[PDB]
């Protein structure tokens, strides 16, 4: 049916731009690979998982995702039952076969097109209604999902809250922030130092709360699109074609890929340092903590200690007056964390609490996080590039953040590429300048 007199081999999948049926097999077979991975990987992780040992020290990135949702963990992120892990893994692994079946089917047996074998499923790219409608369906499916989280947190068990009053623990959220002023407030937050935008969420109430809003707002728009057509501008602005739509979704993922990179790198809440490693700023803070704690025990007065530059070996002031840790760590004075908060006062680090309220669990927490900073090599050798082999480790936060920046990036290229093609495809010159009617040749010379 389709061969070289369509597209070139290395552009094969573009021969499916107008074969709805087969183009469904791909998406159903593909969606299988994602489920397959998630499942097959979880079991791989668990197969190697050692209970009495930090998750971040075992190269896990899925089991800690489950742990966060309050599953198989307890006090301080202690692993209680590995069954929920095994379950989530096997379930997925199975569904991958189910999806995979349909994929293979729709791509090599079933109808090569849909329009006739059912007008409901068949579609036309330029059919502004079918598009807004299918989009509308998905906008609901995603919307229900957003609530599927709100349910698990409020009814079915909770989530892992590191900020837990009694110290990190699975907690049931029964008071989601629904106040729009607060919720949507985050979006009006700066993305720079301090005000951190979305990544600045620091409590489960907002998380759960925000998700309620999204769940609703999403399904609302899901119905709206089912029951409508793009307006006037909406039509005279965009390009309506199979590629153009892709592109739009490409730039969308890209952007989400960058946001994800910063979330796993900066956020403490939705990415617990107990399961992942300590955040970048958290580890550098911990060093200051560790040594202020040490030397203070040796009889040094941290409050008045003067370092080489005359700035304050252990404690100094931020640009706005607050008391912070000294050293190169002055750049991370925006770090907040369970272990360090009890030492903060209304003006920043309180010289009195620091002087006699430091608790042992904090001293060893700081030591732990200090010796587990997100520094490592490709071949997985934890530490600074000049370190020696022995401690095989690279923070999960480092792995996640890098992988997702690469992906996010290439996707922005993917966007540009498919968007540039769509605009040329539309207007109709994505295959060369018309030898005869060469546009430039009809324009006056600027010379």
């Amino acid at each position: 049916d389709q061969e070289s007199s369509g597209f070139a081999w290395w552009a094969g999948n573009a021969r499916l731009i107008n074969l709805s049926g087969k183009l469904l097999g791909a998406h159903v077979a593909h969606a299988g690979l994602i489920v397959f991975w998630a499942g097959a990987m979880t079991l791989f992780e668990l197969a190697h998982f050692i209970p009495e040992k930090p998750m971040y020290e075992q190269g896990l990135i899925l089991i800690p995702h489950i742990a966060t949702l309050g599953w198989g963990v307890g006090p301080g992120g202690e692993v209680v039952d590995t069954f929920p892990f095994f379950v989530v893994g096997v379930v997925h692994l199975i569904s991958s076969a189910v999806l995979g079946f349909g994929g293979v089917y729709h791509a090599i047996r079933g109808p090569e097109t849909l329009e006739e074998y059912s007008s409901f499923f068949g579609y036309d790219w330029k059919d502004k209604n079918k598009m807004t409608t299918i989009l509308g369906f998905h906008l609901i499916v995603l919307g229900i999902g957003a609530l599927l989280l709100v349910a698990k947190a409020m009814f079915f068990g909770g989530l892992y809250d590191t900020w837990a009053p009694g110290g990190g623990d699975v907690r049931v959220i029964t008071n989601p922030t629904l106040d729009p002023r607060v919720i949507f407030g985050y979006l009006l937050k700066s993305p720079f130092g301090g005000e951190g935008w979305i990544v600045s969420v620091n409590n489960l109430e907002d998380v759960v709360g925000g998700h309620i809003w999204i769940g609703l707002i999403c399904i609302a728009g899901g119905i709206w699109h089912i029951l409508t057509t793009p307006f006037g501008w909406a039509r005279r602005a965009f390009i309506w074609s199979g590629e153009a739509y892709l592109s739009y979704s490409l730039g969308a993922l890209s952007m989400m890929g960058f946001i994800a990179t910063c979330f796993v790198w900066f956020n403490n809440t939705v990415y617990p340092s107990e399961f992942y490693g300590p955040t970048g700023p958290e580890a550098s803070q911990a060093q200051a903590m560790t040594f202020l704690i040490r030397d203070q025990k040796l009889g040094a007065n941290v409050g008045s200690a003067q370092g080489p530059t005359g700035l304050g070996k252990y404690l100094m002031r931020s640009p706005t007056g607050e008391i912070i840790f000294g050293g190169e760590t002055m750049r991370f004075w925006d770090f907040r964390g369970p272990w360090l908060e009890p030492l903060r006062g209304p003006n920043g680090l309180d010289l009195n609490k620091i002087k006699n309220d430091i608790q042992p669990w904090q001293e060893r927490r700081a030591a732990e996080y200090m010796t587990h900073a997100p520094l490592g090599s490709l071949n997985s050798v934890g530490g600074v590039a000049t370190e020696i082999n022995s401690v095989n480790f690279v923070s999960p936060r480092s792995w996640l953040a890098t992988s997702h920046f690469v992906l996010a990036f290439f996707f922005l290229v993917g966007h540009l590429w498919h968007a540039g093609r769509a605009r040329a495809a539309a207007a109709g010159f994505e295959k060369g300048i018309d030898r005869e009617s060469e546009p430039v040749l009809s324009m006056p010379s600027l010379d």
């Binding site: 009495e52 042992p360 060893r364 030591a367 010796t371 587990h372 401690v391």
Partner: protein, 137 residues
């Protein structure tokens, strides 16, 4: 140029008596040393307090002496300060604090002897390297 049993002969106790480890214990120790020490004691130093290293001489002038299997083993159960005038098991991994330092839970007396032996065998092989830091890398 090899790890002869001559090199694996390290002091067992304070009263001069020695013990001879085997290439199996060594490797095993080395593995355990990575599992629960390297994190902070990579290459014989101490990241969270660079003033105290694992040099045999340093362990010799410790109090009590920790430059022998018996010593180091005791330490790994009930750790103390360099003068021994204070127990630090709360902020240092040890058997009496495995609840706080999970990595120490598995560890059995067999394992403790290996780790201790490793600490006394390394400087014998590496020499100055074991004690010092980046200067010797």
């Amino acid at each position: 140029a090899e790890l002869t049993p001559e090199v694996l002969t390290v002091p067992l106790n304070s009263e001069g008596k020695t013990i001879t480890l085997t290439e199996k214990q060594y490797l095993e120790g080395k593995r355990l040393f990575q599992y629960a020490c390297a994190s902070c004691h990579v290459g014989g130093i101490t990241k969270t307090n660079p003033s105290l290293d694992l040099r045999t001489e340093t362990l010799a002038l410790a109090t009590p002496p920790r430059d022998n299997i018996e010593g180091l083993v005791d330490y790994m159960k009930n750790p103390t300060t360099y003068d021994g005038e204070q127990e630090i098991a709360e902020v240092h991994p040890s058997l009496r604090s495995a609840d706080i330092f999970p990595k120490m839970r598995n560890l059995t007396e067999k394992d403790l002897v290996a780790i201790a032996g490793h600490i006394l065998v390394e400087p014998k092989i590496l020499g100055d390297k074991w004690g010092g830091g980046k200067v010797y890398y």
